[PDB]
A paper describes a structure:
The membrane domain of the mycobacterial ATP synthase is embedded in the IPM, with the catalytic F1-domain of the enzyme extending into the bacterial cytoplasm and attached to the membrane domain by a central stalk and a peripheral stalk (PS). As do other ATP synthases in eubacteria, chloroplasts, and mitochondria, the enzyme couples a proton-motive force (pmf) across the IPM generated by respiration to the synthesis in the F1-domain of the enzyme of ATP from adenosine diphosphate (ADP) and phosphate by a mechanical rotary mechanism. The mycobacterial rotor consists of a membrane-bound ring of nine c-subunits, attached to an elongated central stalk, made of single copies of the γ- and ε-subunits. The mycobacterial PS is made of two proteins, bδ and b′.
In the current study, the concentration of BD employed was almost an order of magnitude lower (25 μM instead of 200 μM), and this lower concentration proved to be suboptimal for the detection of the BD itself, as the drug was present in only a minority of particles. Therefore, in the various states and substates (see below) the density for BD is highly variable. However, in the current work, by combining the membrane domains of all of the particles, bound BD could be modeled in the same position as previously reported in close proximity to the N-terminal region of aH5 of the c-subunit in a position that would inhibit ATP synthesis. This position is the “lagging” site. In the mycobacterial enzyme, this inverted L-shaped half-channel is clearly present, but the water molecules that form the Grotthuss chain were not resolved. The mycobacterial inlet channel in the a-subunit contains the polar residues aHis12, aHis15, aHis16, aAsp30, aAsn104, aGln112, aAsp117, aGlu122, aLys125, aGln192, aLys219, aAsp222, and aGln229, which are probably involved in the coordination of the water molecules that form the Grotthuss chain. The proton inlet pathway then passes through a small aperture between α-helices aH5 and aH6 formed by residues aGly196 and aAsp222 into the interface between the a-subunit and the c-ring. A gap leading to this channel is plugged by residue Gln7 of the b-subunit and another, between aLeu111 and aTyr124, leads to the membrane and is presumably blocked by lipids. As in the bovine and other ATP synthases, the outlet channel is more open and funnel-shaped. Polar residues aHis146, aArg153, aLys161, aHis166, aAsn174, aGlu177, aGlu178, aLys181, aSer184, aTyr240, aGln243, and aGlu246 are found in this region.
Author numbering:
A (entry chain a): 10 to 247
B (entry chain b): 23 to 84
C (entry chain d): 1 to 61
D (entry chain M), E (entry chain N), H (entry chain T), J (entry chain S), L (entry chain R): 2 to 86
F (entry chain L), G (entry chain O), I (entry chain P), K (entry chain Q): 3 to 86
The structure:
């Protein structure tokens, strides 16, 4: 027994089902991020030695601003910077909160996690990917009217490949979501699989996998942010 | 099944939005101001060094 | 329970690895950036004082 | 005896698996090759990066298309299985 | 004791899956290689885009012709299955 | 016999194909991208920093296929479509 | 079990294998030949004039191998040998 | 009268074999390519040896990892077979 | 059921495998050899005459394998060994 | 009226064959690529041989391992078959 | 049902797999070796003969594997081990 | 109503075919790549033919070791089938 899926704390509202566990995980990640943000806002010092939180936040901002300026000028697309930094920090915290020892035995021989990475739920990745999709398409609309944007995305860089371009435009959101999903989803299974070992043998593969999963989550957050920035740059040109 | 989207899609979105709002209003603007002020401070330090270098010579000349 | 104990031992191993071989370099990077900022502030202060002294000398001459 | 729909569904699952495996191989290797080109070009001409993305992603576009097209048809195999009774 | 159409449909689905897997592998890798050439060329000669996009698109046209011929034959296999009775 | 058994065998084989193809693509693409990265760094070591961004973009583009395949394999073997 | 059904399923699988292999070969060979052509034209533009000669030979040797498969695939599916 | 668990187990064994074959191909070829880059770099700039090991182990980290992931999903298939009756 | 049906289905699948592998090998080998030829003619325009002799050897060898497979495919399909 | 062990053993043999085929493909191609790098390095720098064997053995170590793991699991598939009864 | 039918179908599929692998390996390896030969002859015409000693060795290895497969394929399809 | 040994033998034959196909692919491609390196090295450096055979022989030995281990295990599969009663 591995119990793939099987969300807990599921409830109903307005004839719509909600996976309580993923909402709780997302809320915990948001609380952590907001606490970091407010700790920064109470410690920003332009005339002093920066604190660790300020160093981390400004490193993130510098990286995202450098990427934007490399792709599309900051003056052209200022909002992409907050969008990219928030996406990065959200995904990174969500993935790295899984390293904590919140896994236990469910009394049926199957492992159960008190905290499960929200990106292992299709709803989370779909929300992020579709928000980015709508955002950069709206940015392209603002750049080239209600009309030039669909025209230019359909024709793309080379017009006679219009069909492929359309597929490409549909592939951007899906690839953004599923990729992330898989990266986390697989991880959720691996630990569960490692839970089948006895403790005196479980400790080692679990340690190795979670140590690697730290880097996996970092890389996934970075890739999501970079691709969001670059899609924004593509949608806003000429 | 697990690949079928649910109502959670909205809930998560809402949370993300508020986080973005915070990051948009209390993280990125202050950080941009700090970075710009640091760069202006470095430029001002270089300019002050240059003015000192030219003035130490102008005073001797005059 | 058993899987919880095994996973906790694994997490202890992870934390040991992180503190032993990851915390030192990142802490050094943070210290380096902090010292760079502090040195930049010192450069600003000393350059302002140098400009003040040069202006005083020029006024004297 | 046996249910014809079961045989058709097993065949559809195997066919969709083949579709997605082939698409995966093609996409992964093609993207790796294009990224090798991009990484080399950047390593040799830093400032060229800005002008390298325009062709690079064009390539990737095509390389992605097939994959996702395959994915689309895989859905038709496992959710709208043609010939299923 | 089974409907022959079921066996034929399962075979047709598996064959179409093979066709599309092979087509996807070929398309992805060929496009990746041609795009690697294009990216490297534009890296060496930033002003060569005009001259390069012709051979690059000839190569892409050949590769996509193979891919879409495979796609058409998969459509034949799956929707109008030859030998279906 | 049980139709579900045949459908499950087909789903297992299909998921095996999906994951095998994904692993092949991921391994070879990652190897190629890492080869580009190592060659670039050996040629001019101080690009250690500027190369990582395009390298990780390539890694993301490569892993997209692999992990989309992993997701669809999980669908095949845990929520099998058309399972009677 | 009608013998023609088993034979037709086997023939369809075989034709699918034939076309998949042919497409893999054709796509990758065309990509490699086109890579050579694109690099050659990038190095020197006038060489284009001559480069299309060997290129068409290479593609000629590639596409041919593909098209033969096509024919045989047809033989497999439309006039199945040993159809019984 | 054939036991369905037998068919499910045979399918699981075939799927696990496919997973491990794909993982082995990917790991072997990716590690070989990364090692080719490493050997060429060390031949070119011996004193860069150490500074080359950083990207190398990253590539291996992203290659070998995938292989071992496949390994896990093989064990599942052949030790906790999904859908087993 | 009829043994002929099973044997013919197996023969068709085997012949499909033979031809698919032959097509993959021929296409990719011809592409690689033609890439070498195109690059050589690009770098040294006057070398076109000299490069055919190796190129026709390489291609020859490659084609050999393909056509040998083709022959065996026919033996599988039209003269199925073990048929009964 | 078929022995379940027969079906499971046939599946195990096919899976082990897939495992060994993938392992051999990966091992052969990876070793060939690493050796190509080694041969090129020794050709360009005849004296570099000494050092080049260090990274080479690493690459082979990362390749052959992937092979010899597959081997082990193949021995598991066809000698202690999971799910057998 | 005749067990020999099942064994013969399995033998035909196995022989098809063996020939597919042999053809792929032979074609691609010969293409790569010939690419090296053509590039070397383009670079060093004086070496045209000199390069044939290693080239043949390479081919001698590649083809050898191919032909070994061929032998075993015969053993699979003509004297099938396990008929009963 | 099939002999269990018949199904086992068919599975063993398919598995051995997979073993030999994978081994042949790996051996051919690895030997081709090693020979590519050898030929290029001899072309660039005329007198390196004598000293290049050592790394070339090492690479070919690894590749052929993989191939012949596969051959031995195919012989095991086909002539002494594990699990065959």
């Amino acid at each position: 027994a591995i119990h793939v899926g099987h969300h807990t704390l599921v409830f109903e509202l307005f004839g719509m089902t909600f996976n309580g566990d993923t909402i709780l995980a997302t809320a915990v990640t948001a609380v952590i991020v907001i606490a970091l943000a407010f700790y920064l806002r109470a410690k920003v010092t332009s005339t002093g030695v920066p604190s660790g939180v300020q160093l981390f936040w400004e490193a993130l901002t510098i990286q995202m601003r450098q990427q934007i300026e490399g792709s599309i000028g900051m003056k052209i697309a200022p909002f992409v910077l907050p969008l990219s930094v928030t996406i990065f920090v959200f995904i990174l915290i969500s993935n790295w909160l899984a390293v904590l020892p919140l896994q236990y035995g469910g009394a049926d021989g199957a492992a159960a996690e008190l905290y499960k990475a929200p990106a292992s739920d299709i709803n989370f990745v779909l929300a992020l990917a579709l928000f980015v999709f709508v955002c950069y398409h709206a940015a392209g609309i603002w750049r080239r009217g209600i009309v030039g944007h669909p025209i230019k995305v359909v024709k793309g860089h080379v017009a006679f490949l219009a069909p492929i371009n359309i597929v490409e435009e549909l592939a951007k959101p899906i690839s953004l979501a599923l990729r992330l999903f898989g990266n986390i989803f697989a991880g959720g299974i691996l630990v569960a699989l490692i839970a089948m070992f006895p403790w005196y043998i479980q400790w080692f593969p679990n340690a190795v996998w979670k140590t690697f999963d730290l880097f996996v989550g970092l890389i996934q957050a970075f890739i999501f942010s970079l691709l969001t920035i670059l899609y924004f740059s593509q949608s806003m040109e000429l | 099944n697990f690949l079928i989207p649910n109502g959670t899609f909205f809930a998560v979105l809402i949370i993300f939005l508020i986080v973005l709002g915070v990051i948009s209003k209390w993280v990125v603007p202050p950080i941009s101001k700090v970075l710009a002020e640091r760069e202006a401070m470095l430029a001002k330090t270089a300019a002050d060094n240059r003015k000192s270098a030219e003035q130490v010579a102008a005073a001797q000349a005059d | 329970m058993s899987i919880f104990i095994g996973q906790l031992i694994g997490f202890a191993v992870i934390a040991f690895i992180i503190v032993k071989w990851v915390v030192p370099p990142v802490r050094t990077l943070m210290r380096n950036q902090q010292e760079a900022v502090r040195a930049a502030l010192a450069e600003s202060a000393e350059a302002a004082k140098k400009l003040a002294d040069a202006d005083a000398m020029h006024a004297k001459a | 005896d046996l249910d014809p729909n079961a045989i058709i569904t097993a065949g559809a699952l195997i066919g969709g698996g083949l579709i997605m495996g082939g698409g995966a191989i093609g996409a992964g290797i093609g993207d790796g090759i294009a990224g090798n080109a991009l990484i080399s070009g950047i390593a040799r001409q830093p400032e060229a990066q800005g002008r390298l993305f325009t062709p690079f992603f064009i390539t990737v576009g095509l390389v992605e298309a097939a994959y996702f097209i395959n994915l689309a048809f895989m859905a038709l195999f496992v959710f709208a299985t043609p010939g299923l009774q």
